[PDB]
């Protein structure tokens, strides 16, 4: 954090992309509920036996 760079180099600052999520005109209905596992952004969620928001996974017993 302390010393500066005297050398010569390249670098990127980043690369933006859009993230388009909607594709139609249905109503958009939400409610918040309590989770029960780790959940990312825009992950498909299910509900376990207690009502917690477990992320979606088929092939379960």
């Amino acid at each position: 954090t302390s010393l500066p760079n005297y050398l010569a180099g390249n670098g990127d600052l980043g690369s933006w992309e859009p993230t388009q999520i909607f594709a139609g005109e249905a109503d958009i209905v939400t409610e918040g509920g309590a989770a029960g596992a780790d959940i990312e952004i825009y992950q498909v969620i299910a509900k376990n036996a207690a009502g917690a928001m477990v992320p979606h996974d088929p092939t379960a017993t």
Binding site: I28, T30, E31, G32
Partner: protein, 51 residues
């Protein structure tokens, strides 16, 4: 006021109502009869002998 992430819709809050009270008054009727037996004998501030 509730905290809402700025994508989702929102929250709805309930309200309250009324109450009533009614009353009716009560009725009071005292009275006296007056005989000649109460008028005649001597009221105290009166001189002796002749009233």
């Amino acid at each position: 006021a509730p905290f809402v992430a700025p994508n989702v819709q929102g929250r709805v809050i309930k309200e309250s109502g009324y109450n009533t009270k009614t009353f009716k008054p009560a009725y009071v009727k005292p009275k006296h009869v007056i005989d000649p037996n109460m008028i005649i004998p001597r009221q105290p501030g009166e001189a002796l002998g002749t009233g």
